[PDB]
Tab-separated table of C-alpha atoms and ligand atoms in Angstrom:
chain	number	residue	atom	x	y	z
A	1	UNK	CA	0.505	-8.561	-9.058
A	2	UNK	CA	-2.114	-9.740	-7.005
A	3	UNK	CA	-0.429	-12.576	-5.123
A	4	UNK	CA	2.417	-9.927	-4.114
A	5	UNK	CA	-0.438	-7.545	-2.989
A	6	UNK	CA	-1.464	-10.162	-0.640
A	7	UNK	CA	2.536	-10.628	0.535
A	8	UNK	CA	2.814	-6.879	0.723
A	9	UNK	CA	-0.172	-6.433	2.797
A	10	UNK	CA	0.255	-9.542	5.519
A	11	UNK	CA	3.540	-8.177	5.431
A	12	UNK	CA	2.248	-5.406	7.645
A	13	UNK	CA	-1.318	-6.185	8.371
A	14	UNK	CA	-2.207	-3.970	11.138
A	15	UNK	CA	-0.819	-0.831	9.592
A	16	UNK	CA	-2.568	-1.080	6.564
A	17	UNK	CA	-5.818	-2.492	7.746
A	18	UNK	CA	-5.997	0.633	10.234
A	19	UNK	CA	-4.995	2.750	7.408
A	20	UNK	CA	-7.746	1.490	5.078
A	21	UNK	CA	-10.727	0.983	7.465
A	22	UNK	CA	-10.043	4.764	8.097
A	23	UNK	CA	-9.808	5.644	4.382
A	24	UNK	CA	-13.364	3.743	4.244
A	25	UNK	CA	-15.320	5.388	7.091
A	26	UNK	CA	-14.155	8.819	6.165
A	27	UNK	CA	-14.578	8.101	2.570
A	28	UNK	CA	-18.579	7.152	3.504
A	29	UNK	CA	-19.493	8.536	6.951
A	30	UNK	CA	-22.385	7.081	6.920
A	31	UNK	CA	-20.921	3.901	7.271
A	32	UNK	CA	-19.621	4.616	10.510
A	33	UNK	CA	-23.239	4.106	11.975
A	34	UNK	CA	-22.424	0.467	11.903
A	35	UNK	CA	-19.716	0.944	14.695
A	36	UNK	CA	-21.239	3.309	17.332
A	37	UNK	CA	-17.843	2.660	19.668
A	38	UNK	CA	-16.296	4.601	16.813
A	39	UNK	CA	-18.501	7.366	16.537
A	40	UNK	CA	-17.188	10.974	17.642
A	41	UNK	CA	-13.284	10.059	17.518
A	42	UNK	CA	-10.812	11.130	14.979
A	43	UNK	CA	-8.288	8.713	13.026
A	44	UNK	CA	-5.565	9.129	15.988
A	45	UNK	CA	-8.151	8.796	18.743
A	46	UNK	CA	-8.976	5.428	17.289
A	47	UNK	CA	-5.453	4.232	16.616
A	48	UNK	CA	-5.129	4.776	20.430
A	49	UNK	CA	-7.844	2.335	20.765
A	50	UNK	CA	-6.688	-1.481	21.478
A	51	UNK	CA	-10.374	-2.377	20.236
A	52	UNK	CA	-9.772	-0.740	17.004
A	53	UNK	CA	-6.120	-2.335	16.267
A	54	UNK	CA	-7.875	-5.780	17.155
A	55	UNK	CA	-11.454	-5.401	15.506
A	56	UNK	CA	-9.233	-3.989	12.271
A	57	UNK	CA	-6.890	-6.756	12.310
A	58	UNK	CA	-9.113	-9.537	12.130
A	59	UNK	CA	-10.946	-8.275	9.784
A	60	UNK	CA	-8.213	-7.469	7.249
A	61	UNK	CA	-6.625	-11.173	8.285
A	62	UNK	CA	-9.742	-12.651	6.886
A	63	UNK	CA	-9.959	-10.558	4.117
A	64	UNK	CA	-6.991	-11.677	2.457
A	65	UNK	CA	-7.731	-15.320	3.404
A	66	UNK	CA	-10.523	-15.228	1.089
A	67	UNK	CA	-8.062	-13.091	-1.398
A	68	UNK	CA	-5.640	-16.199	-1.315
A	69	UNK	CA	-7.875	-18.715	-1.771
A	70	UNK	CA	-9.734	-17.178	-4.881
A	71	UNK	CA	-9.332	-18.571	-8.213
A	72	UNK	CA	-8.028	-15.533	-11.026
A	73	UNK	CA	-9.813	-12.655	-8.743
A	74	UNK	CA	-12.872	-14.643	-7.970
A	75	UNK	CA	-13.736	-15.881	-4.704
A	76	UNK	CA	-14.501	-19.406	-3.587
A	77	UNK	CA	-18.614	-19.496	-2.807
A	78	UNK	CA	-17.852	-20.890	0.701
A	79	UNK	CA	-16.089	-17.984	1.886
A	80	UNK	CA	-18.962	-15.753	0.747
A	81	UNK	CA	-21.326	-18.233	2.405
A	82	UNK	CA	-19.386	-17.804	5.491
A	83	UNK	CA	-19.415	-14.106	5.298
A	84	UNK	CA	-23.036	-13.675	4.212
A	85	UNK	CA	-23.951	-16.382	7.574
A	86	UNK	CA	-21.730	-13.838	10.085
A	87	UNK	CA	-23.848	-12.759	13.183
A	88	UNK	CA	-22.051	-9.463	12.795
A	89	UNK	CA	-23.051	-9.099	9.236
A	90	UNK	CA	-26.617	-9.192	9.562
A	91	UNK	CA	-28.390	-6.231	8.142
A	92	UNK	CA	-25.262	-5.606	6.108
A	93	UNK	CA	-25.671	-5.505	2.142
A	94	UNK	CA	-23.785	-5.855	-0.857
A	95	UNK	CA	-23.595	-2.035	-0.598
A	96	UNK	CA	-21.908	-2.214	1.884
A	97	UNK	CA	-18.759	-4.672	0.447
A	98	UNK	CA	-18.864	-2.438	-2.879
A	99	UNK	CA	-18.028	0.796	-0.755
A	100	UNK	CA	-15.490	-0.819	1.401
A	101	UNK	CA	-13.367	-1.859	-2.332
A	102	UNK	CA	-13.931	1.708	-3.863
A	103	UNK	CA	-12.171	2.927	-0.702
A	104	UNK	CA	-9.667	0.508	-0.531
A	105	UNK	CA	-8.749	0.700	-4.664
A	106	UNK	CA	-8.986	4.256	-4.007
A	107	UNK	CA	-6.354	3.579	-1.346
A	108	UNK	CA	-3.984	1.882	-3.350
A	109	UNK	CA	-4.233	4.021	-6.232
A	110	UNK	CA	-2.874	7.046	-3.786
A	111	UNK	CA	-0.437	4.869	-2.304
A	112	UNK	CA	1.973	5.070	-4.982
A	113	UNK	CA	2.686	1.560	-4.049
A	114	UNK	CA	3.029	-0.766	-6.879
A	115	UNK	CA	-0.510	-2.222	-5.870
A	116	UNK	CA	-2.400	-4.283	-8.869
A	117	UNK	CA	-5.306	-1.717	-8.458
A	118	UNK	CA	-7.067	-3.704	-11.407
A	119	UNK	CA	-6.867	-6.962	-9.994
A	120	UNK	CA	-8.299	-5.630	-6.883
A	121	UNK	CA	-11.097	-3.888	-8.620
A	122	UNK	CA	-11.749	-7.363	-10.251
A	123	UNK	CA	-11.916	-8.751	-7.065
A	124	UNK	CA	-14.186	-6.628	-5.009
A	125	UNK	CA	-16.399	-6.798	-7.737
A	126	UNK	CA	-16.633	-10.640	-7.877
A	127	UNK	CA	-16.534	-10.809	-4.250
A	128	UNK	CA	-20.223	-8.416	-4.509
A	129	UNK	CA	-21.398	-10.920	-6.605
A	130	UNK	CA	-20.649	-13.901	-4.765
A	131	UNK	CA	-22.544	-12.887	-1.996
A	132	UNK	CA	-25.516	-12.033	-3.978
A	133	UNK	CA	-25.112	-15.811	-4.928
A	134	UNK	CA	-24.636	-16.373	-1.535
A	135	UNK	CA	-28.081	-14.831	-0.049
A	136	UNK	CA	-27.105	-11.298	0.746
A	137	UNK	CA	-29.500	-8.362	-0.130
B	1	UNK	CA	-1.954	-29.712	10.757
B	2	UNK	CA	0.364	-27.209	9.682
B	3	UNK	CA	-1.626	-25.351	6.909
B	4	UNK	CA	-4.192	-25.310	9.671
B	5	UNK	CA	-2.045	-24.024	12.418
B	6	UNK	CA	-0.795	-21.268	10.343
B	7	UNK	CA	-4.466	-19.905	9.902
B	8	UNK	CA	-4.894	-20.197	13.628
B	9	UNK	CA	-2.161	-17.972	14.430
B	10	UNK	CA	-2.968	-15.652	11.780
B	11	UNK	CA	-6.509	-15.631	13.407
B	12	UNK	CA	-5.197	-14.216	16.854
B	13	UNK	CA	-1.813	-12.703	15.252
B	14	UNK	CA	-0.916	-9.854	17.802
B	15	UNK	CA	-1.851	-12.175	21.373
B	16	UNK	CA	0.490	-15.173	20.054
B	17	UNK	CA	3.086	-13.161	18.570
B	18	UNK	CA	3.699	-11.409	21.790
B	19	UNK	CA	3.153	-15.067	24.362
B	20	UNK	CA	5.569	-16.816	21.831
B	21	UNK	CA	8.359	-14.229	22.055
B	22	UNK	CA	7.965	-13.676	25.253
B	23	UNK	CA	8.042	-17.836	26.238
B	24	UNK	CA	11.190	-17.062	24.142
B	25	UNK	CA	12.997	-14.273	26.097
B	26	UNK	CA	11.798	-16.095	29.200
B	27	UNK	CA	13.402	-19.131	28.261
B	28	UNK	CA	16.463	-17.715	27.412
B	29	UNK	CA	17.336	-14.760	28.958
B	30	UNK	CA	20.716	-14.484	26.860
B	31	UNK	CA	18.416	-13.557	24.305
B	32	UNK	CA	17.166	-10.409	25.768
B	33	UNK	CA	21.070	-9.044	24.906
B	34	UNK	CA	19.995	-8.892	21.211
B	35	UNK	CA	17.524	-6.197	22.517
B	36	UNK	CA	19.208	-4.155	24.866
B	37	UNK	CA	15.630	-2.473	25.764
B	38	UNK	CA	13.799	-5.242	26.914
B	39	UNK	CA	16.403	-5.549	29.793
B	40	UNK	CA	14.954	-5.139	33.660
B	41	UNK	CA	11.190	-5.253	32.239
B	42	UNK	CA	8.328	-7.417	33.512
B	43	UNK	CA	6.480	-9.148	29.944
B	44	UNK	CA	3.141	-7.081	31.041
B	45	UNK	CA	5.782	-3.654	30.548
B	46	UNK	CA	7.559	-4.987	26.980
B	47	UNK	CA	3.643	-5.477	25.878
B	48	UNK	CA	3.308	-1.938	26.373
B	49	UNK	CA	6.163	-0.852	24.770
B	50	UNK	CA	5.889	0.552	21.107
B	51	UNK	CA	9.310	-1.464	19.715
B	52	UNK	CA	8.184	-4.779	20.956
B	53	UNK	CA	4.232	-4.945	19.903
B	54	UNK	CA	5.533	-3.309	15.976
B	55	UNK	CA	8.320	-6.155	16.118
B	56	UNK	CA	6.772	-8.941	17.334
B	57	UNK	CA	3.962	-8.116	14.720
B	58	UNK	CA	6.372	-7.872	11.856
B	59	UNK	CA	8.594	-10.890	12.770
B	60	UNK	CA	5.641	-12.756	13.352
B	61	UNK	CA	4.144	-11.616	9.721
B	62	UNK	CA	6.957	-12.509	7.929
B	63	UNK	CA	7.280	-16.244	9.745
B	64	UNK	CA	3.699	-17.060	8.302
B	65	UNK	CA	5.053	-16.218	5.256
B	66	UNK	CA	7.791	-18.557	4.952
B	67	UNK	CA	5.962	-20.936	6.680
B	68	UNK	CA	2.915	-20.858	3.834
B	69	UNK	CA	5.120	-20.775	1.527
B	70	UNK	CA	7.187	-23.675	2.808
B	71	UNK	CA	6.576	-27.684	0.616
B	72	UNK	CA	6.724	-30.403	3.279
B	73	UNK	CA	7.941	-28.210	6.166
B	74	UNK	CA	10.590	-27.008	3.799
B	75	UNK	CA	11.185	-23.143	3.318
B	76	UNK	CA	11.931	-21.534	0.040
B	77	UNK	CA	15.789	-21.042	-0.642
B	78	UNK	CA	14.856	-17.811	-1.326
B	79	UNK	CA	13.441	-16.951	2.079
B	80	UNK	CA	15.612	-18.010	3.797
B	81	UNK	CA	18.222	-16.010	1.753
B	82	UNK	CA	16.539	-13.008	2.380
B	83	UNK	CA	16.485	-13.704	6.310
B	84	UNK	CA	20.160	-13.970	5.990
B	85	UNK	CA	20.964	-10.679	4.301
B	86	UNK	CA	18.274	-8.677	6.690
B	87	UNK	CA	21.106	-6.045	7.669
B	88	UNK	CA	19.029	-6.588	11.363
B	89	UNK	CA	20.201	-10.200	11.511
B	90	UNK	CA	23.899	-9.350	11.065
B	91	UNK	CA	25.303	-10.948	14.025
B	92	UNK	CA	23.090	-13.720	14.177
B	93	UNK	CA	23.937	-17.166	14.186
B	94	UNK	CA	21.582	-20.123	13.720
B	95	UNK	CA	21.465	-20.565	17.398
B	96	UNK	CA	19.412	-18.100	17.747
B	97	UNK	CA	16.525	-19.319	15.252
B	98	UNK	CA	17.188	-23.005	16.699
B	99	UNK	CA	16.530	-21.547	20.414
B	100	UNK	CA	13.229	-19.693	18.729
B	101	UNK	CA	11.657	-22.926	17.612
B	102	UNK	CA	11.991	-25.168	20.380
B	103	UNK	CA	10.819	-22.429	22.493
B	104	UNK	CA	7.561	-22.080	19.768
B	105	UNK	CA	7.318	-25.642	19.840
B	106	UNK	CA	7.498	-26.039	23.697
B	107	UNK	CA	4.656	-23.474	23.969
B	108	UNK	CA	2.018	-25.393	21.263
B	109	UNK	CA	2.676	-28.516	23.060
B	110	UNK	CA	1.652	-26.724	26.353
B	111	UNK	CA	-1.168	-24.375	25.112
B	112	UNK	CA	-3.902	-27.857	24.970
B	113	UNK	CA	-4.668	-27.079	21.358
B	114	UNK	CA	-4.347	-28.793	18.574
B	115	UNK	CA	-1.446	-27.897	17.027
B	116	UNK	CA	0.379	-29.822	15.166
B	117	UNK	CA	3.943	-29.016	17.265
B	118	UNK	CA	5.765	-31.984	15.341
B	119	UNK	CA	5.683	-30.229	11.706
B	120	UNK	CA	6.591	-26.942	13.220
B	121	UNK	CA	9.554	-28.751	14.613
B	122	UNK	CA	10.992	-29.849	11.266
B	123	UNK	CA	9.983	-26.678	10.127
B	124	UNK	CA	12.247	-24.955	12.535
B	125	UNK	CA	15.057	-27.553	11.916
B	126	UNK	CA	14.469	-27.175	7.855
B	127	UNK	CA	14.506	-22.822	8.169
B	128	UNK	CA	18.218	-23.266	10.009
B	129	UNK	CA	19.374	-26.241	7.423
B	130	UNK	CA	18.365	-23.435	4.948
B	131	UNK	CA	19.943	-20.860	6.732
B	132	UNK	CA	23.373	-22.280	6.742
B	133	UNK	CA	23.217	-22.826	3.291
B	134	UNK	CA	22.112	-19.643	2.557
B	135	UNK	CA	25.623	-18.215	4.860
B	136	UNK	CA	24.559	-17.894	8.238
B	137	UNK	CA	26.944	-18.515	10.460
C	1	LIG	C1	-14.286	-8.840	2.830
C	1	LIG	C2	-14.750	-7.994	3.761
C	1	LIG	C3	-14.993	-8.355	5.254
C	1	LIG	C4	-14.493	-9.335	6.033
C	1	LIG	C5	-13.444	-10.420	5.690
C	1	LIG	C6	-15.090	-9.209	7.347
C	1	LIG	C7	-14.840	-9.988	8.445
C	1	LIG	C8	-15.221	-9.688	9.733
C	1	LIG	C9	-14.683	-10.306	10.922
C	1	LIG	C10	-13.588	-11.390	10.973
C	1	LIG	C11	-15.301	-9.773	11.975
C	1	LIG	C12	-15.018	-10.101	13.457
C	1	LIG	C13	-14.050	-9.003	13.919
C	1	LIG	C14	-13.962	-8.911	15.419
C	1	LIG	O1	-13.981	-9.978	16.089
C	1	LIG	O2	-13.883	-7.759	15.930
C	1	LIG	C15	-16.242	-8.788	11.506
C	1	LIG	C16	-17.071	-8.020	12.303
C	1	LIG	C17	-17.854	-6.980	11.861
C	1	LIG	N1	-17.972	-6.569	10.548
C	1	LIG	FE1	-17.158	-7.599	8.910
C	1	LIG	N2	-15.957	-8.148	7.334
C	1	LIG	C18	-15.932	-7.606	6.069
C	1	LIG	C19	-16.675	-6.532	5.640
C	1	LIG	C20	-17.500	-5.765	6.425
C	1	LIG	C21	-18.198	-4.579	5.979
C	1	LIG	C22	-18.098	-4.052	4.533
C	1	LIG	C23	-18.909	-4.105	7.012
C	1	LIG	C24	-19.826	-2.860	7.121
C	1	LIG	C25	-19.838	-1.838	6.258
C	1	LIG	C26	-18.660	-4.972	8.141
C	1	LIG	C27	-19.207	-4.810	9.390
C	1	LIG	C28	-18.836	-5.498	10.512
C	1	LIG	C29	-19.284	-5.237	11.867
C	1	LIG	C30	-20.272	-4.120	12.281
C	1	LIG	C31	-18.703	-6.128	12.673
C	1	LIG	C32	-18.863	-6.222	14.209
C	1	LIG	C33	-17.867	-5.243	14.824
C	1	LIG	C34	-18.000	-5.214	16.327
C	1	LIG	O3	-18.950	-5.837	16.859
C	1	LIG	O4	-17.149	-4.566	16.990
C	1	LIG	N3	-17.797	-5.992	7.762
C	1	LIG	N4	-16.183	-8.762	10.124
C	2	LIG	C1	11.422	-16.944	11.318
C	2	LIG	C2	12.194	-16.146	12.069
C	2	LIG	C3	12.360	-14.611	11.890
C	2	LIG	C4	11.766	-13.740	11.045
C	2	LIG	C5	10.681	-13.960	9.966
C	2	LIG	C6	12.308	-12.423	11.315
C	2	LIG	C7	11.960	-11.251	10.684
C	2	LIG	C8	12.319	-9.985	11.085
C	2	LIG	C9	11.769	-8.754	10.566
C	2	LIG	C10	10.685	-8.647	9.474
C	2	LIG	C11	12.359	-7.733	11.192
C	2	LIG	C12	12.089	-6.231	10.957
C	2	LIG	C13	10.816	-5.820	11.693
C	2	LIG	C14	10.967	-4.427	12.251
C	2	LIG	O1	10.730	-3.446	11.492
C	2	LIG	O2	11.320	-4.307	13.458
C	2	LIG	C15	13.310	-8.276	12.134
C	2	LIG	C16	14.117	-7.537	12.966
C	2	LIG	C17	14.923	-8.049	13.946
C	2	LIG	N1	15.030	-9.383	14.259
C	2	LIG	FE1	14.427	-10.994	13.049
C	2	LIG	N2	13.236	-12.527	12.324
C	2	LIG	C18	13.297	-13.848	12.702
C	2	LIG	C19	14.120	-14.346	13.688
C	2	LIG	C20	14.884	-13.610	14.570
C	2	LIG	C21	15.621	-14.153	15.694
C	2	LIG	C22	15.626	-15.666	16.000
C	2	LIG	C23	16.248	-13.132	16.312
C	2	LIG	C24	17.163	-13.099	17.567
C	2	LIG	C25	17.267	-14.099	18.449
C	2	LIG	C26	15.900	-11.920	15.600
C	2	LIG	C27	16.333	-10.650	15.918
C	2	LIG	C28	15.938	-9.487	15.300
C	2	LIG	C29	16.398	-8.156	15.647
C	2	LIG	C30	17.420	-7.817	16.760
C	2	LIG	C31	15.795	-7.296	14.829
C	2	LIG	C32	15.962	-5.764	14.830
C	2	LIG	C33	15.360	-5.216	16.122
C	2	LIG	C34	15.071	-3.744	15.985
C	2	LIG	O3	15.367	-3.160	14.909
C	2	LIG	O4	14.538	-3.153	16.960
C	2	LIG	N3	15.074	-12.246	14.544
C	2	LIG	N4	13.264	-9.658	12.042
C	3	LIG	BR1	-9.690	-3.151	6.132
C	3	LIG	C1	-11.188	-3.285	7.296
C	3	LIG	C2	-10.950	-3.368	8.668
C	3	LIG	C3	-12.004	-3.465	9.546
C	3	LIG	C4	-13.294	-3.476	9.020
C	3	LIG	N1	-14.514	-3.565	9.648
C	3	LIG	C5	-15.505	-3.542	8.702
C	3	LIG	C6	-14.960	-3.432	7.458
C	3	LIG	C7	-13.541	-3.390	7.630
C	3	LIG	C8	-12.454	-3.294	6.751
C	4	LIG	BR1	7.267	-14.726	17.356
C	4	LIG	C1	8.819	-13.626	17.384
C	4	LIG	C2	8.652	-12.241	17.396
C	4	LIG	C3	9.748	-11.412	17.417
C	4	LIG	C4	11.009	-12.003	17.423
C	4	LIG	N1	12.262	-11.437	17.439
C	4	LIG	C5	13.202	-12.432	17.438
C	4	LIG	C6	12.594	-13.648	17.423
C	4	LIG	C7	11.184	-13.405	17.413
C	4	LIG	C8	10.056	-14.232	17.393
């Protein structure tokens, strides 16, 4: 279930935190505008990339911080707080979040892992609204 | 304190993963027979190397783990059997996991912050009480 998910994925966080950041910008190119040193590479281009193993690491770390700490798939309001109040997250919206966990469900569906897609689903979606509580657009 | 400390390393996984088994290998260079590789090679040339960043990563991983996991500095019997019957650590003894803590321990209490170097201690001294009861030699 979910708490395994979490196990699974820390269990090798920079693999699949590379593999899903990918999955998400080439899932929504669009997003990719948000990271112009990524712009005009392809997947093993940016694997090659220290920046991108870091940047992708930390991210994914903190992402299943909040996962761990949430109560039956819904996240604490401080940790949406914190990531509405990120320097690096303003101009970001909730449209942004929702895309990032339709690629990433999308992700574990095609795994063929035995990844609680639902629960994830649940999440992501809880997670949107939380930072609509929070003060994100 | 040690909840804490755990999220710090998490934080900046790949950097202290690779200074803490380095301080390691440095600190006993017996050690460097388990991994006939890293033989004749400067720390700033095993960094480079593909072996040592994926397995410092995934040791490194895993010891969160346990650690989180962990009541009171204590590990879970059953991580500690699973460490044991890791076909990689046949050949191990508990020496080597004693050595790995007080090296860990020796570079907290030398890094100036504030970890709290007396819980991962016990912890290290708990994980090899564990591991001898789980059959490590
Ligand atoms: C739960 C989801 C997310 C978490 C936990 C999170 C967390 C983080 C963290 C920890 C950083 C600092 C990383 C570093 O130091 O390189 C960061 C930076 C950043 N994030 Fe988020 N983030 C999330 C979602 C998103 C989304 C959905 C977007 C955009 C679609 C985004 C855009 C950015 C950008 C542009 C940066 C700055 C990157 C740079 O300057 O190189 N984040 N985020
Ligand atoms: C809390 C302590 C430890 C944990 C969680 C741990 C965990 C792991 C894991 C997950 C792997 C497989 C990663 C991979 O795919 O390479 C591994 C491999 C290995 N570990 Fe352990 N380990 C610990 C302590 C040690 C110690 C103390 C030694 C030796 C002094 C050691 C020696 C090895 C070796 C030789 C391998 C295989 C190397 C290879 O395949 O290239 N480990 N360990
Ligand atoms: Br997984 C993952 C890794 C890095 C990221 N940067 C922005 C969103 C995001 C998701
Ligand atoms: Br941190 C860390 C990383 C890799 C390791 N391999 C054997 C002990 C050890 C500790």
């Amino acid at each position: 279930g979910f708490k395994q998910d979490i196990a699974t994925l820390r269990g090798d966080l920079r693999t699949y935190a590379q593999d899903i950041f990918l999955a998400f910008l080439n899932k929504y190119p669009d997003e990719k505008r948000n990271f112009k040193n990524y712009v005009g590479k392809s997947d093993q281009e940016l694997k090659s990339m220290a920046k991108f193993g870091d940047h992708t690491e930390k991210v994914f770390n903190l992402m299943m911080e909040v996962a761990d700490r949430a109560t039956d798939c819904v996240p604490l309001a401080s940790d949406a707080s914190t990531l509405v109040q990120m320097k690096q997250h303003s101009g970001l919206t909730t449209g942004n979040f929702e895309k990032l966990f339709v690629a990433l469900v999308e992700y574990m569906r095609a795994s063929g892992q035995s990844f609680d897609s639902q629960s994830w689903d649940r999440f992501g979606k809880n997670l949107v609204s939380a930072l609509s509580s929070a003060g994100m657009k």
